[PDB]
């Protein structure tokens, strides 16, 4: 009985040795796609920083990001937190932003749009803004890095459909 149990144990330990080798090789393939995926977002982050450095096509983008965050807050006052580079642009387009919020929200225009003395991290944030509550409680991290993170979380099935063909074993 001990020999039979040892044979069964050796037979059972034989399958595990093949199973562990199979799982490790299958996870290497899965981690290859995630490594290829991260290369896309790493290349996308570099391209996003290029859009911020244009300073000519960034102003239409930068104004849109504030209005997009302002329309979500839906309050007459806000505290825009932008990079130290963008403060001049924000102060230049404050009036246009207030008018756009007044027009896009079908409500009286923004009362005031304060630019916080505190600034975003230069290295961490490629561009964008972080529009916050008048009390600085409710904030919208509308930065380009945060938007890219949200896109990487959301559009992952679409990215898979773009890179690879539709799954062969997915009937419906």
């Amino acid at each position: 009985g001990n020999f039979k149990s040892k044979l069964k144990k050796a037979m059972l330990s034989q399958q595990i040795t093949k199973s562990t080798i199979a799982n490790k090789m299958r996870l290497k393939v899965l981690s290859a796609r995630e490594q290829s995926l991260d290369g896309i977002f790493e290349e996308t982050k570099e391209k996003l920083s290029g859009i911020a450095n244009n300073r000519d096509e960034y102003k239409p983008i930068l104004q849109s990001l504030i209005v997009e965050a302002l329309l979500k807050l839906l309050e007459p006052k806000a505290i825009v937190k932008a990079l130290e580079r963008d403060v001049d642009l924000i102060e230049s387009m404050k009036d246009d932003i207030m008018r756009e919020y007044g027009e896009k929200a079908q409500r009286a225009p923004l009362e005031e749009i304060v630019i916080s003395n505190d600034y975003l991290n230069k290295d961490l944030v490629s561009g964008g803004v972080v529009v916050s509550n008048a009390s600085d409680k409710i904030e919208i991290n509308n930065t380009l890095e945060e938007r890219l993170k949200l896109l990487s979380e959301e559009a992952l099935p679409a990215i898979r459909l773009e890179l690879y063909g539709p799954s062969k074993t997915r009937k419906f």
Binding site: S19, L27, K72, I138, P157, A158, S167, R170, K171
Partner: protein, 457 residues
């Protein structure tokens, strides 16, 4: 081409209350019910949460990872704006995930094929197929006496200390028709049980087609609410959108319902029996009713929710309501386990609502249903006569009662008793059952039809 859309989320930092497992916000802008939020602790670690209730501005959020360490001033709650969507894929099979769906197998985050809501959508009853395809579980007490049809929500009722884990692992190992994908959902089980299930699947070669959602006793307790829904939406994906045959093995649904009671008790709601939420029937129905076959699909979800009766009591709310929703049960008996019978399945409280459809008339064999009825009748007579002989002595027991006592002994000892790794085909189990029934004279066998009795005795 949907999904390519960015919607910035509202960080709040307006937490107003932490009452046990719940977190209350105070100034949410248009709060959405059953919404997922991402709490950012003062330490920097992120805990997910689900909006349980909403007021004009408040939003009671239940944190899945627990509320320990949640400050009121430096805790920021970010509203994702959508109910919990698990990223499912065909490559999700073969991986191990935490209670919240986060992989714990030292592998990459699952490369999403689609984002499926945990609650799913209620299948149209007109779109369901009646499950009439029996599964040969290898166990005699199940293949013969309470048959499981491919697409049945048949739980395992076992008290603490009983080998329900061993029985369910045996069923998973040997569950062919008279290959299955397994979606195992650990909820509050100990590391010993989790290691047992994982190692058994690895030894039997099931990891290639098993997705374990392990939520151990060490893991937080509010994640027991979320684990079975993730496992069942994974099973629904694999079985309806990829046309596989899935065997969902939710374990410790008693632990899940205890997590429900803890969540309900923090909300000061009107309680049910033993303090459980009044809507526990609804939650258990939402979880159990995610099993069966649909018309257009060639796939199935076989559900075997292991369930721990707190004190070996069927009348307890968890086993009661589950009996109500599920369609059967496999009652594991502490008395049988103490007697040493494996599997210690007590066939009297055990039941299978789909036996009458999946058994007999050419599906398995002409004698299956009659033999099962006769076995149940004789086992009940044996139990009653053994009680009568213990109370009022052996004189009260008649010849039929003595025969029933002998049959019960030879039935528990030789028919129910079956060591693990022993595959008893339904035909072999029926032959053994007939050998057990030949103890009785042909006349005394009551429920057996005359034709079957003449053809088989």
């Amino acid at each position: 081409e949907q999904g390519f859309n960015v919607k910035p989320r509202l960080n709040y930092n307006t937490v107003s209350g932490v009452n046990g497992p719940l977190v209350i916000l105070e100034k949410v802008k248009f709060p959405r019910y059953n919404e997922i939020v991402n709490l950012t602790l003062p330490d920097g670690t992120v805990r997910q949460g689900q909006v349980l209730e909403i007021r004009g501005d408040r939003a009671i959020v239940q944190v899945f990872e627990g509320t320990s360490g949640i400050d009121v001033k430096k805790t920021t709650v970010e509203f994702t704006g959508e109910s919990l969507r698990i990223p499912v894929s065909e490559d999700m099979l073969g991986r191990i995930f935490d209670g919240s769906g986060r992989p714990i197998d030292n592998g990459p985050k699952v490369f999403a094929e689609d984002y499926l809501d945990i609650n799913g959508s209620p299948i149209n009853p007109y779109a369901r197929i009646y499950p009439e395809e029996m599964i040969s579980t290898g166990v005699s007490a199940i293949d013969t006496m309470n048959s499981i049809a491919r697409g049945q929500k048949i739980p395992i009722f076992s008290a603490s200390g009983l080998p329900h884990n061993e029985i369910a692992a045996q069923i998973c190992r040997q569950a062919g028709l008279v290959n299955f994908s397994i979606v195992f959902a650990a909820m509050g089980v100990n590391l010993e049980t989790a290691r047992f299930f994982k190692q058994d699947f690895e030894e039997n070669g099931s990891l290639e087609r098993t997705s374990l959602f392990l939520n151990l006793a060490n893991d937080p307790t509010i994640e027991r609410i979320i684990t079975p829904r993730l496992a069942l939406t994974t099973a629904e994906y694999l079985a309806y959108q990829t046309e596989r045959h899935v065997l969902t093995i939710l374990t410790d649904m008693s632990s899940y319902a205890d997590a429900l009671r803890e969540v309900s008790a923090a909300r000061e709601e009107v309680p049910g029996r033993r303090g459980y939420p009044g809507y526990m029937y609804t939650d258990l129905s939402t979880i159990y009713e995610r099993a069966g076959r649909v018309e257009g699909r060639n796939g199935s979800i076989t559900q075997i929710p292991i369930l721990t009766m707190p004190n070996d009591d069927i009348t307890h709310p968890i086993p009661d309501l589950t009996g109500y929703i599920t369609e059967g049960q496999i009652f594991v008996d502490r008395q049988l386990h103490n007697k040493g019978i494996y599997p210690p399945i007590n066939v009297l409280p055990s039941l299978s609502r789909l036996m009458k459809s999946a058994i007999g008339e050419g599906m398995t064999r002409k004698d299956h249903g009659d033999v099962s009825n006769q076995l149940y009748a004789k086992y009940a007579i044996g139990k009653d006569a053994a009680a009568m002989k213990a109370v009022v002595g052996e004189e009260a027991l008649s010849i039929e009662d003595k025969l029933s006592l002998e049959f019960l002994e030879k039935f528990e000892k030789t028919f129910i008793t079956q060591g693990a790794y022993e595959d008893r085909t339904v035909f072999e189990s029926l032959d053994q059952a007939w050998s057990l029934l030949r103890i009785y004279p042909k006349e005394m066998l009551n429920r057996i039809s005359p034709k079957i009795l003449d053809e088989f005795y």
